[PDB]
Assembly symmetry: D2
Homo-oligomer: 289 residues x 4
Amino acid sequence: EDICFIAGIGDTNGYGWGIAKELSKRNVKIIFGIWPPVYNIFMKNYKNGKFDNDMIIDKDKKMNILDMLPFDASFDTANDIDEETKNNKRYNMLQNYTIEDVANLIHQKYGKINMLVHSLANAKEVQKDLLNTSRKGYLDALSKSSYSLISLCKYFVNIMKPQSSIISLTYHASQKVVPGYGGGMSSAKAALESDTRVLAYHLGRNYNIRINTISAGPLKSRAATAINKYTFIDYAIEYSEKYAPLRQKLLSTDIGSVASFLLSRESRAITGQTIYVDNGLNIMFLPDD
Amino acid sequence: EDICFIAGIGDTNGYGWGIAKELSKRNVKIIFGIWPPVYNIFMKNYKNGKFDNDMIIDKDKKMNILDMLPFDASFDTANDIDEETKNNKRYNMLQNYTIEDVANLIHQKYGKINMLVHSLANAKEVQKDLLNTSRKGYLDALSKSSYSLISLCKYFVNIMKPQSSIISLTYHASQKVVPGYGGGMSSAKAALESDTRVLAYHLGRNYNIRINTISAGPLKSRAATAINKYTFIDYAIEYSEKYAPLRQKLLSTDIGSVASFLLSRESRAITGQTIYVDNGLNIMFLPDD
Amino acid sequence: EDICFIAGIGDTNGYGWGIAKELSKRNVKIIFGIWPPVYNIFMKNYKNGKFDNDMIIDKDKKMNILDMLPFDASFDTANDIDEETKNNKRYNMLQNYTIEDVANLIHQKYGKINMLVHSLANAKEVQKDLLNTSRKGYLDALSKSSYSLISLCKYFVNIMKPQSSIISLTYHASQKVVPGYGGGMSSAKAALESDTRVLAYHLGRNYNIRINTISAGPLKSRAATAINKYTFIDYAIEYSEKYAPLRQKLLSTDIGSVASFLLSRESRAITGQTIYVDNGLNIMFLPDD
Amino acid sequence: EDICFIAGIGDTNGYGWGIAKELSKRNVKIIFGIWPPVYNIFMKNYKNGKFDNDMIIDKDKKMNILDMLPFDASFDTANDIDEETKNNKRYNMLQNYTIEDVANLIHQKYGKINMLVHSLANAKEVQKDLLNTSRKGYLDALSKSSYSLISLCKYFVNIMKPQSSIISLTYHASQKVVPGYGGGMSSAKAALESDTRVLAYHLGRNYNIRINTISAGPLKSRAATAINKYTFIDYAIEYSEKYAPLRQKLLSTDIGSVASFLLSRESRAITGQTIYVDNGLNIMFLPDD
Ligand SMILES: NC(=O)c1ccc[n+]([C@@H]2O[C@H](COP(=O)([O-])OP(=O)(O)OC[C@H]3O[C@@H](n4cnc5c(N)ncnc54)[C@H](O)[C@@H]3O)[C@@H](O)[C@H]2O)c1
Ligand SMILES: NC(=O)c1ccc[n+]([C@@H]2O[C@H](COP(=O)([O-])OP(=O)(O)OC[C@H]3O[C@@H](n4cnc5c(N)ncnc54)[C@H](O)[C@@H]3O)[C@@H](O)[C@H]2O)c1
Ligand SMILES: NC(=O)c1ccc[n+]([C@@H]2O[C@H](COP(=O)([O-])OP(=O)(O)OC[C@H]3O[C@@H](n4cnc5c(N)ncnc54)[C@H](O)[C@@H]3O)[C@@H](O)[C@H]2O)c1
Ligand SMILES: NC(=O)c1ccc[n+]([C@@H]2O[C@H](COP(=O)([O-])OP(=O)(O)OC[C@H]3O[C@@H](n4cnc5c(N)ncnc54)[C@H](O)[C@@H]3O)[C@@H](O)[C@H]2O)c1
Ligand SMILES: Nc1ccc(Oc2ccc(Cl)cc2O)c(Cl)c1
Ligand SMILES: Nc1ccc(Oc2ccc(Cl)cc2O)c(Cl)c1
Ligand SMILES: Nc1ccc(Oc2ccc(Cl)cc2O)c(Cl)c1
Ligand SMILES: Nc1ccc(Oc2ccc(Cl)cc2O)c(Cl)c1
C-alpha cells in the first residue's frame, strides 16, 4: 500500500492529475488536497462522472482515489485561520483544511504515507511585471507558492514512512528572465528551487527522506490560461513546440511519468535536484528563427 | 557630481562602508540610508569622531558624506507605516523614512543621482533551519531582504539620471546549501539573485539602467556576528581563508572596489549578473583537508 | 524488445556493470563493448562463471548478456587503427572493433537497437594536475572521454529506432574543482556535458532521439584507483558518505536504475540534461563539521 | 609599470584590439603576440600608419604598443614546431614564436610582466555541426582554443609577479546551445571555463595569480565571419541588439574596459569566474516578440 498525497488540483487539466495517472500504473493510492474554494465544485464534477473517462489509467485500471479533502497552503495551523475565511461564504461548510489539519486527517484515517507532491501555485499580481508588483502581492506569492512547500514538509514528514519522497513543480522563469511571468512567480520559483536543496539536506540527513522539484514546460491548465498576458500560455506552448529540441507536444503525464520515477526507490540516490521535463527547451539559447 | 545612495549601514564594519570608501576614490558623493533604530545612535558615533579615522580615504581625502538619513526597507510608502512604529519609542523623533519618502527627500535636496546600492538584510529567525522557520519569519525575511530591492528600484528609478547603475549583495548560500544560514536567508538571497535578472531586463529595456548583485564571502560585520549558530561567521571565515583559492583575508573594500567598478560606465555592458567577490571559494567542491 | 549497447564494461566493479544489471530487471537485451586490453581476460572470467554470483539480480533473475564484443572508442572507422595497435599482442586476434564496424556488426546480427550507453573515459595523465598536463595527454583525454560519445552518436544513430535513448557518465569536477582530478579529465567532462546539450538538439530535431548524462558520485572502480593522489577514490567515498544529504553507500546499481529510467520512454520529455545521481553531494557548499 | 601580453591581435576589428586600446587608457605597456599567418601583413599595415586613426583613445591619447611578436599557440616549445610549418612560406623568416620561446623572449627584454591576455581560438570545422565534426578537427579546436591557455599559464607564470592577473574570452554557446557554433568550439569554450576554475585554484594557492574569463556578446571580427551559416555573426549581432536588456551596439572596447578591470588590483578578490559582458543577453529565456 503506497499512499501519495497530491496537494494542488482543481480539474484534470493540470500536472497533479497527470502526476496521479502515471502513479496509478504503480497502483499507488491517491489522496487529493483541493483548495477550499473549488473543493465542492470539484467534488461535484467528480460525482457526476466528468472525470470517469479521465480516470481510466492505461493498464486497464480505474484511478484508485483514496480520498479528496479540502486543503489550503496559505494556512499552517488551525489558529492562523482569520475572521475573514472564518466567514468567507465557502469555507463555512468546510473544516480541517490547514496544512497541519490535513496531515492529521490523512494520518488518522489512513496513517503513514510515503510520497508527497506539491503541485500548487498562485501569484495574485502575475499580470504586473516585477518592477510594478506590490509587497502584498509578492509576499503573498511567496507564501502561497514557496513557503507552503516548506510548511508542508514540516508537518507531513511526521506521518511519512522512512525514506519517503517529495517533489514540487517549478518554472525556468526562475533562472532566465521570461517576460510576462510576473507578480513574484519568478522570485517565488527561484526560492522554491533553492529551498529544495536546503530541505534536501535536512530531510535527508535527519529523516533520510528525499526531495526534488520538476521544472516543467508549458501546459494549458486553468492556472496557465488564467495568467493572461493570444495569452501568455498560448505563446509559450507555440514557441516550445517550434523550438524545443523534442518536437512533440508535452503532456501532463510526461511530467507524470517523471514524477512517478522520482517518487520511487528507483531514484534513491537523487535529491535536492531540479529536473527539467520541458522537452529540452531549457538547453537552447537563441532560436533558429 | 556623482551621488550614490547606499541603503544599509550601521557602523563601519560592513560592506556598505567598504563600498562607500572605494567610491570616494572616484570622488562620488555619498548618501547613507540608515535603519531608524540605529540612526541617531549612528549619528552620535559620527558626531563624536568615531568614524574620522575610518573615513580617511586612501588618496589623501576625507569621505565626502553628502548626508545620512533614516531609512526602512520594510516600508514602501508613508501609509504602510502602522500604529506600532507610529508609537515605537525611536521612530517618534524621525520622519520620512519610508522607501519613497527618502527618494523624494534626496531628490528634493540634491536631485537626480546615478548610483544605487542595496546593502541590507535581516532574517528574524536566521537561527532556526529552513524546516523550522515560520511563515511570519520567512516572509518577513523576504520582505526585508528581497522585495525591498524591488521597491527601492521602483521609487528610485524616477530620480536617477539616464544609464544609472544599481547593485545589491548576495550570498552563495542561495545556490548550494550552507547549514546555519537559515530563517529564509537562503530563500531570500535565491530570490534576490533571480529578481536581479528580471529587473535587469525591465530597467535596461525601458530606462536603460543596469543592475547586478555581488556575491561576497565571509565578513565579520555586526549582522554576521549577530547571526549566532565559535559563531557561524567565525567558522565561515576560518574555512574560507584556509580553502579559498586566494589565501588572503577578504576586505570590505574588496567588495568595495568591485562595487565601484560595477557602478561605473566602465562596465556598461554588464547587467543582471551575480558577480562573486569571494576570493574564489565558490569554485571549490570538496576541501583538500 | 529493447537492445542496449553498453560501451564500457571491463569487469563488474563499475557503473558499466551496475547499469547492465538494472537494465536486465526491465528485461532489455544487453551487448557489451569491451576494450581490447581487457577483452581476453573478461571473456575468460565470464566462462569460468566468476561473474555468476555478480550477475545476481535480486528478483532471483539471472542477467541476460546477449553478445560481448571487442570495442575501442579511439577509432572511428577501420582506417583509423594505426599499424602498431593493429599489430599489438592484445589486438591481433580481434576485429571489427572500431566505432563504425561495431555499429554495422550490431545492426547486422540484430538490426536497429534502441538504447546506447556510453560508460568510458581515459586520460593518460589523470595523475598530473591540469597546469602540468601536456597538450598530448589533454587532447588524448577529450579524444577518449569526450569525442568518443559524439562519434558513437553519429555512427550508431543509424541503427537506432526513433525515440531511442542515449546516455553517458560524468563527474561534478567539471562544474566544481576537485583537486586531483587531472590530466584533462575535468576539461573532458566539461565538454561531454556541453556536447550533451548540442547533441540533444541535433539528435532531437533530426532523429527524435534523446541523449542525457548522469553525474555519478564516487564508486571504487578499476579506473578510480588508477587515479593516484587511501588514494583519491577512497577519500572521495569517505568524504561523500559523511557529507551528502543521504548517508548511505552509493551503489553502482543506483546510477544503474537511473540510467534505466533515462533510457526508457518514462523520460521521453528530458534531453540534454546532466542528472546528478550522487546522494546529493553537489548541493553542498560548506561542510557540517 | 604594468606589462601585458595580449596573445590574439590580428587586426583592429576584434576584442584583442579593443582590450589593448582600453589597457592603454590606464597606461599599461602592451605586447602583441601575432600569429605567423597574419604577422607580416599586420606589421605592414602598422608601418603604413593605417591603424593610426584606430589607435585613437578618446582622451586624445595615442595607444602605446611596446613590442609586437610572432606567436603560435599550437606549439608549446620549439621542439613542437613540425618540419612543414618550420619551413612554411609565412614562418621561415620568424623565430622564437612558441609559447615557451615568447615567454623567455618577453622575460629577457623586459623581465616579469603582470597581465596575461588570451584572445585566440581556432577550429578548422567551425562550419560543420558537432555531430559531423571529425575527431581531428575537434581535438584541433580544443588544442587551439582550450589548451593554448593552460600552456600559456604554465610557461608564463614564471615571468609574472605575484598578484598579476590573467584572462581569456569565451562564448555562451558552451552553456547554452546556439546552432551553428560547431567544429568543437562549444566544447572548447566548455573546457576553457572549467579549466578557468581548476587553473584559478592552482594559480591562486601557488602563485597568488588570478585567472578569469570574459563571456562576450557578438562582435564582427575577422574570425566571426569565418563562421559560415548575413552569415552567423550578423544574425547574432541583430538578434542581440534587439533582445538584450541593454539595446546598444556592443563595442569591443566594452569587453576591453572589463578585461582591464579584471586585469587590475580592483578585482583582487575574483578568480575562476566567467564574467558575462554582453548587454545581458544570457539572462533571457524566451523573447519579447
Ligand atoms: N502549466 C505549466 O505550463 C507549468 C509549468 C512549470 C511549472 N508549473 C507548475 O505546476 C504546478 C501545478 O499547476 P498547474 O499549472 O498544473 O495548474 P493547476 O491549475 O492544476 O494547479 C494549481 C493549484 O494551486 C492551488 N492553489 C493556489 N493557492 C492555493 C492555496 N492558498 N492553498 C492551496 N492550494 C492553492 C489550487 O488548488 C490549484 O489547483 C504549479 O506550481 C505551477 O507553477 C506549471
Ligand atoms: N558579512 C558577510 O560575510 C556577507 C556575505 C555575503 C552577503 N552579505 C550581504 O551584505 C549585505 C550588507 O550586510 P553587512 O553584512 O555588510 O552588514 P551590515 O550589518 O553593515 O548591514 C545590514 C543592514 O541591514 C539593514 N536592515 C535590516 N532590516 C532593515 C529594514 N527593515 N530597513 C532598512 N534597513 C534594514 C540595517 O540597517 C543594517 O545596516 C547584506 O545584504 C548581507 O546579506 C554579507
Ligand atoms: N567510479 C566513479 O566514482 C565515477 C564517478 C563519476 C563518473 N564516472 C564515469 O563512469 C564511467 C565508467 O567508469 P567506471 O568509473 O565505472 O570505471 P570502469 O573502470 O569500470 O570503466 C571504464 C571502462 O572503459 C573502458 N575503456 C577505456 N578506454 C576505452 C576506449 N578507448 N574504448 C572502449 N572502452 C574503453 C575500459 O574497459 C573500462 O572498463 C566513466 O565515463 C567515468 O568518467 C565514474
Ligand atoms: N567576435 C565575437 O562575437 C566573439 C564572441 C565570444 C567570444 N569571442 C572570443 O574572442 C576571442 C578573440 O576572437 P575575435 O572574435 O576578436 O576574433 P579575432 O579574429 O580578432 O581574434 C582571433 C585571433 O587569434 C589569432 N589566432 C588563431 N589561432 C592562433 C594560434 N594558434 N596562435 C596564436 N594566435 C592565433 C589570430 O591572429 C586572430 O587575430 C576568441 O577567444 C573568441 O573565442 C569572440
Ligand atoms: N497565479 C499562478 C500563475 C501561474 C501558474 O502556473 C504556471 C502556468 C504556465 C507557465 Cl509557463 C508556468 C507556471 O508556473 C499557477 Cl499554478 C498559478
Ligand atoms: N538577519 C541577517 C543575517 C545575516 C546577514 O549577513 C550575512 C552575514 C554572513 C554571511 Cl556568511 C552571509 C550574510 O548574508 C544580515 Cl546583513 C542580516
Ligand atoms: N583514465 C581514467 C580516470 C578516471 C575515470 O573515472 C572516474 C573515476 C572516479 C571519479 Cl571520482 C570520477 C571519474 O570520472 C576513468 Cl573511467 C578513466
Ligand atoms: N576558427 C574560429 C571560430 C570562431 C571564433 O570566435 C568567435 C566568433 C563569434 C562568436 Cl558569436 C563566438 C566566438 O567564439 C575564433 Cl576566434 C576562431
